[PDB]
Nucleic acid binder design. Structure first.
Ligand SMILES: [Mg+2]
Ligand SMILES: [Mg+2]
Ligand SMILES: [Mg+2]
Ligand SMILES: [Mg+2]
Ligand SMILES: [Mg+2]
Ligand SMILES: [Mg+2]
Ligand SMILES: [Mg+2]
Ligand SMILES: [Mg+2]
Ligand SMILES: [Mg+2]
Ligand SMILES: [Mg+2]
Ligand SMILES: [Mg+2]
Ligand SMILES: [Zn+2]
Lengths: 143, 103, 141, 63, 56, 145, 100, 82, 53
RNA sequence: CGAUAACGAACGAGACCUUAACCUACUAAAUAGUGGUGCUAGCAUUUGCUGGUUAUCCACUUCUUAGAGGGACUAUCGGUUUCAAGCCGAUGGAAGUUUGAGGCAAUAACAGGUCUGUGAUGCCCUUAGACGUUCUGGGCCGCACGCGCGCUACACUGACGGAGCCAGCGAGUCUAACCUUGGCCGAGAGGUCUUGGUAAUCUUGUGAAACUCCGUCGUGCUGGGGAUAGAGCAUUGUAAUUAUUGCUCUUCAACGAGGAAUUCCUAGUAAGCGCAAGUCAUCAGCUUGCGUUGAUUACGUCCCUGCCCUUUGUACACACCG
């Protein structure tokens, strides 16, 4: 019927597509991974250390599929949280800029996302061709 | 899971057990504050019951490995049978004895 | 052209506009199906309008709901009001008035805010306190 | 509380003294004929004078 | 090239300043207010006094 | 899924860096008992040592924990990015250190002694025992001693 | 030709009959026109303490200023454009014309 | 240095941290006759940690000892196979 | 000498003053009017600010 | 309302004005938004699903905005009361506590506060080794202690990690350099190159936090809490030492729900949770607002504390501090 990325739950599609990333093994992971903690407001680095670039990449892939175009400044706001400022009240603090810009560069290499007119990154037709195909694959799992 | 009988039927007879039937009020009497036993509304009885049930779950599931859900069940079971080991049953008879003291 | 009506449900700040037209029967919320609405508890809250009247009145119409404003649980209530009003608007225009009244009565018996928006609005904050009623602290010595 | 003041209760009884055969036991027709036949500066006050005049008429049907 | 918020608030403070000047020195002619009128090619300021012969 | 029979080699106590590290907890949180290593650093060493972080402290092999302590005591030679160390670009040596257990306490006393020896303002504030970061003292810390 | 009249006063009743007289004098000259777009009214609020000193109960006070802004788009040869803006200028109402 | 509280301690039992043969068959033999199985009951009757309780709970549910009712996070609700 | 009035006054409370009474405290800088808080309250009605609510 | 030597009014209350809630009724709109038709992308393949597109253009106003208006008046019914003013249920209704919330706010006062807001001010002082003005450096922040508004917490109704993911009020530069998108470098905080915006056009869907789903923790002053200390890297600024602020790593204290006392509060309210604005070169644990999530309890009374009134006594009347 033409199943798409919108027709499947956000959690399991991101998990399934990230596992597609771990098997494909072609992502150009940065090298400072497992030393960084990916937000200035965060307190620890990602507990699931051996992935989580693949998790982040799958997460960012769905976002450009939904929206028109994003930049890296938008993604830091999305992935930021409340920073416990000790004895002071909490505050929204943006995420680590390098993490978003590099995985956006990394997704350019595999050909999922492309540059856009009017600024930002846009899902390419290669991106709009395989994200549906995992979405077909991941939604028959319970059927 | 713990008893086969219907859960909301367990909840509905639990609050009927933990409604305090007679209760005391504060008349002054002069210096030493005096007690007078009066009767309770059915609305107040339901009102008291919900508060008595949930405070017991809260103080028992606090600083303790048990989650609040599994705590909330067991006093609701314990009250619906009626045991005097439920906090809501223990508070209920405690009010009635002070009311019984003042008739 | 094609038989179609347009309704809206509201909540505190959430508004959800719904396009109800004649179709094959798919009920989408922001381009995604109705079964995907994230807060898992209140998903079973948004089923209840079609679960009240039976799914048979949703075979021959297809539903699009577009949702903006408010918060998470406010968005859920605006969705359910929009589809309930949209269904009752569709039977008002095209189908007879008998089907409208049995549709309306079952909704209005179960829960009144499926068709009528809740009128509870925010109360303005007043100088001298954190809230609208609360004051900060009085101290005498 | 919804106790009406002098202005509502005084203008209405004056209005009934000189317009009793025109006006009726229905607030709506009442709220239309006052609007031409008297000057009230606000719509809210016109709605309360007409509402009390409708109330007084029902009292006049019985005694 | 200034925004409409600032532009309207500027003309308020312009009126307020020009009213204070007229009320301070033109007191002995019965100054009772001022009006300002922006117009293509000109701004016109209508002084309202009592001894109009004295202001001229 | 994975249930595992633990065996008789296990230790309720272990000694690294002259400190009685308790067993029975995860290795990264267990090594934070050792002064000069906190939760962040502790994760990185056990990551750089290629150990399974899911293990408890008392059951880890003899070679692995001595491998761990080498990465702690020569951090930047094993690709730690060295703004991650506590005492980097030091005042005499110029090089990036990372004091451990007793060094943290001993070296903290020493740089205090410079400010006391040159009679710098912060040193004189420490000698009186008052605050040094510019705090108000008219009400707070009242019953400090 | 695409000229555009924009009104930005604070007096609503002065502004409207200015705007009505633009659109009615347009229709004797029979011009096609985008009828007045009313942008959201913007409220300039200033919240100050009442007291000049700092004594008493902490009573605040909010002065506000409402600014109403409309635009009408017109296409016209030059002689009407010279005529329309030359007349119907009302005090406290700001008028400005932009072309294209 | 008066304090206006009393501040008694507690007993602080030592719940088991690694699983061995005596714990292993003990959970194997008495997870039946439990009508309701969760993390907290396993802590109280078997003296194991929440760590062990959560992992053992996952273990039984594929092979077969306990039937699930609800697989939400932070609260697992399990019944017996009769 | 040149040293007179030589300290910078580019920022801070010393750079701005009420356009009516040349005071430094309680200035109102919103919308660029720069009148002190007690002088604005005396001039708010004829500037165009009014009380409604 | 009623009683009735009183009738009839005035000010204050109320009315009024602002604001929030309703309007498929009117007037209209690429600076608001749908639907189509062009042009396309992906997936299916039947006759569909979801997007992208600014010169595809044609129509539309439901949702957005504000002009003019309408609408509620406790309407209708029942009950109870000199059967009156009213009150209490039910039905209808967008709305039935003054529809919600404010703005305004009498007579008579007070030795209340303000001469440090004023080029508002009388008098007194000072006026060239000045109590004027300016410059340099300190101080207002100093700490044995006693108080008063607050912030963070004492923990699994939780902490941490990943994933989802949604507001409203608003502010913003030109003869200046404010709000900043996007690309790149950097773990970060930040740097740099361009761009849009004098603004329903751009920042900006201000992708806010609580929250939700999966995971690690597993009753341990513990992965609770993050005070107090040590090293570096940046930013504002002429200047940051008595650390300006921000970031990293390390050190990781009290505190296990708090005595006598005491405060605020009746529904979108309390409480939780953030954001904008004001001050602002830099600095929010403050205030003014705004949304988000949303209870329990009551629909009474004069017991306590205040204030008002009546009767009464008075040798008081700068009035019991008589
Ligand atoms: Mg797209
Ligand atoms: Mg618990
Ligand atoms: Mg004071
Ligand atoms: Mg009744
Ligand atoms: Mg912590
Ligand atoms: Mg914001
Ligand atoms: Mg220390
Ligand atoms: Mg008390
Ligand atoms: Mg709060
Ligand atoms: Mg006597
Ligand atoms: Mg006398
Ligand atoms: Zn001034």
């Amino acid at each position: 019927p033409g199943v798409s990325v919108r027709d499947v739950a956000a959690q399991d599609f991101i998990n399934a597509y990230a596992s597609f990333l771990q098997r494909q093994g072609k992502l150009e992971v940065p090298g400072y991974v497992d030393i960084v903690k990916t937000s200035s407001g965060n307190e620890m680095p990602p507990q699931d250390a051996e992935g989580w670039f693949y998790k982040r990449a799958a997460s960012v892939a769905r976002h450009i599929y939904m929206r028109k175009q994003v930049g890296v400044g938008k993604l830091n706001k999305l992935y930021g949280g409340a920073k416990s400022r000790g004895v002071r009240p909490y505050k929204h603090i943006d995420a680590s800029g390098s993490i978003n810009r590099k995985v956006l560069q990394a997704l350019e290499k595999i050909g999922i996302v492309e540059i856009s007119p009017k600024g930002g990154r846009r899902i390419s037709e290669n991106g709009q061709r395989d994200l549906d195909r995992i979405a077909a694959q991941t939604l028959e799992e319970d059927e | 899971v713990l008893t086969d009988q219907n859960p909301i039927q367990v909840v509905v007879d639990a609050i009927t057990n933990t409604g305090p039937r007679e209760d005391t009020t504060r008349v002054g009497g002069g210096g030493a504050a005096r007690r007078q036993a009066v009767d309770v509304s059915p609305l107040r009885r339901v009102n008291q019951a919900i508060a008595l049930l949930t405070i017991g779950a809260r103080e028992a599931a606090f600083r303790n490995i048990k989650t609040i859900a599994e705590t909330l069940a067991e006093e609701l079971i314990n009250a619906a049978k009626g045991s005097s080991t439920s906090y809501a049953i223990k508070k209920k008879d405690e009010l009635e004895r002070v009311a019984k003291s003042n008739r | 052209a094609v038989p179609s009506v347009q309704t809206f449900g509201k909540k505190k700040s959430a508004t959800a506009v719904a396009h109800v037209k004649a179709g094959k029967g798919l009920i989408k919320v922001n381009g995604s199906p109705i079964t995907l609405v994230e807060p898992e508890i209140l998903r079973f809250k948004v089923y209840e309008p079609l679960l009240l009247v039976g799914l048979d009145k949703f075979s021959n119409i297809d539903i699009r709901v577009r949702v903006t404003g408010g918060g998470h649980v406010s968005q859920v209530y605006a969705i359910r009001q929009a589809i309930a009003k949209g269904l009752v608007a569709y039977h008002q225009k095209y189908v007879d008035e008998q089907s409208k009244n049995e549709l309306k009565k079952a909704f209005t018996s179960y829960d009144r805010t499926l068709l009528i928006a809740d009128s509870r609005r925010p109360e303005p904050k007043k100088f001298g306190g954190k809230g609208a009623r609360s004051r900060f602290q009085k101290s005498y010595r | 509380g919804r106790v009406r003041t002098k202005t509502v209760k005084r203008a209405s009884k004056a209005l009934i003294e000189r317009y009793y055969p025109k006006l009726t036991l229905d607030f709506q027709t009442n709220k239309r004929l006052c609007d031409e036949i008297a000057t009230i500066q606000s719509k809210r006050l016109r709605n309360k004078i007409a509402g009390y005049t409708t109330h007084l008429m029902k009292r006049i049907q019985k005694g | 090239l200034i925004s409409k918020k600032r532009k309207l608030v500027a003309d308020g403070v312009f009126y307020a300043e020009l009213n204070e000047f007229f009320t301070r020195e033109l007191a002995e002619e019965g100054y009772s207010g001022v009006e300002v009128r922006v117009t293509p090619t000109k701004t016109e300021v209508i002084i309202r006094a009592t001894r109009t012969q004295d202001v001229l | 899924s994975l249930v595992v029979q633990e065996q008789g080699s296990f230790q309720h106590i272990l000694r690294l860096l002259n400190t009685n590290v308790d067993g029975n907890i995860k290795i990264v949180y267990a090594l934070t008992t050792i002064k000069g290593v906190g939760r962040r650093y502790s994760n990185l060493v056990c990551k750089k040592a290629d150990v399974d972080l899911h293990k408890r402290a008392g059951e880890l092999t003899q070679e692995e924990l001595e491998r761990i302590v080498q990465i702690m005591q020569n951090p930047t030679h094993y690709k730690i990015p060295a703004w991650f160390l506590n005492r980097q670009n030091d005042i005499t040596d110029g090089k990036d250190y990372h004091t451990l257990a007793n060094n943290v306490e001993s070296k903290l006393r020493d740089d205090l002694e410079r400010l006391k020896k040159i009679r710098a303002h912060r040193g004189i504030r420490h000698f009186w025992g008052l605050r040094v970061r510019g705090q108000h003292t008219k009400t707070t810390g009242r019953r400090r001693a | 030709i695409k000229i555009r009249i924009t009104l930005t006063s604070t007096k609503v009743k002065q502004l409207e009959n200015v705007s009505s007289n633009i659109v009615k004098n347009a229709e004797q000259h029979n011009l096609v026109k985008k009828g007045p777009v009313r942008l959201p009214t913007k409220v300039l609020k200033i919240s100050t303490r009442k007291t000049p000193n700092g004594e008493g109960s902490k009573t605040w006070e909010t002065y506000e200023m409402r600014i109403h802004k409309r635009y009408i788009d017109l296409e016209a040869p030059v002689q009407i454009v010279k005529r329309i803006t030359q007349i119907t200028i009302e005090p406290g109402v700001d008028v400005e014309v932009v072309v294209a | 240095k008066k304090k206006w509280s009393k501040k008694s301690m507690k007993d602080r039992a030592q719940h088991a941290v690694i699983l061995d043969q005596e714990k292993y068959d003990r959970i194997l033999k008495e997870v039946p006759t439990y009508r309701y199985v969760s993390v907290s009951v396993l802590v109280d009757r078997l003296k194991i940690g929440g760590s062990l309780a959560r992992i053992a709970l996952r273990h039984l549910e594929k092979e077969g000892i306990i039937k699930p009712i609800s697989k939400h996070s932070k609260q697992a609700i399990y019944t017996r196979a009769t | 000498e040149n040293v007179w009035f030589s300290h910078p006054r580019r920022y801070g409370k010393g750079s701005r003053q009420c356009r009516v009474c040349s005071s430094h405290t309680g200035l109102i800088r919103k919308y660029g009017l720069n009148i002190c808080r007690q002088c604005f309250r005396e001039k708010a009605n004829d500037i165009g600010f009014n009380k409604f609510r």
